[PDB]
Each structure stands twice: as structure tokens, then as C-alpha cells.
Amino acid sequence: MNLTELKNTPVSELITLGENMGLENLARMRKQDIIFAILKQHAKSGEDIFGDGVLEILQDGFGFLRSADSSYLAGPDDIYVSPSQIRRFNLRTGDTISGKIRPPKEGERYFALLKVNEVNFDKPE
Q: Which one-letter DSSP state was computed for residue 37?
């Protein structure tokens, strides 16, 4: 299961998928909140979850992967990328990244990149 796929899924279908995995009251939430709930539930089940986006490294040194159609506009489903991941793979703003992500923990706000699988559609090598 991956974030962009879910983002491209009709809400009624997301509701069904979520219900089938033990979630409730989905209809009343914003689509993005429904998606968060589903990915979190799936990950809690020990299943891998993926995400992708265009990287933008900010001032502090960390970055976020944003949807390509976002033209770099910040959003709640932005995927956090750590300074260590950027250094590990010499990541650059404008780079397209895809990989495993993890749901935010208690107090956490964003989904975070867990493993960089591809950089500019190629092996991180």
C-alpha cells in the first residue's frame, strides 16, 4: 500500500478499505485524515507502507517530499526527510524520492521516510 495510490482513490472506496481493516467513523473525516488512519492501521499490522514525492530541503537542513503537482506547496501529507537521510544519499532539492514510510508517533505530525528505495527513479547507488 502506498500514499499516492490512496490519494488517488475515491473516498467511498477508501471508506470500504478502512472499514474492512477495523476502522470506523471514516465518512466524517477529511480524505487526508481517512488516508492517515488507513496507513497507520496497516503499518500497525506489520505491513510495509510506501510513499513518494519531490524533495525540497529547507533551511534547517531537513526536507519534505511533496506531490509533484503541488509545485512545492507544503501540505499535511508531506513526507519528512531527515538530514541524515539527505547526507546518506547526497539528496538534492528537486530530487524525486520513493521508499518505505512510517506513520507519525504520538505527538508526531508527519509521515516519515523510513527507507529510501529510489532516487530519481534509480537505485540510491
A: H
Q: Write out the residue range of the structural domain in which residue 34 sits.
A: 2-47
Q: Is 9 helix (H, G, I), strand (E, B) or coil?
A: coil
Tally of helices (H runs) and strands (E runs) in the chain? 4, 5
Residue 55: strand pairing partners:
65
Could you tell me if residue 123 is inside a domain?
no
Q: How far apart are CA 106 and CA 99, in angstroms?
A: 22
Query: What is the resolution in angstroms?
Result: 1.5
76, amino acid identity: P
**What cell was used for 50?**
510506501
Q: Which residues of 90-118 are buried (b: 16+ CB within 10 A; e: fewer)?
A: ebeeebebbbbbbbeeeeeebbbbbebee
Residue 99's CATH number: 2.40.50.140
What's phi and psi for 120, nearest 5 deg? 55, 45
Q: Kindly state whether residues 85 and 55 are assigned to the same domain.
A: yes
Sign of CA dihedral 87, 48, 68, 23: negative
The experimental technique used to determine this model is X-ray
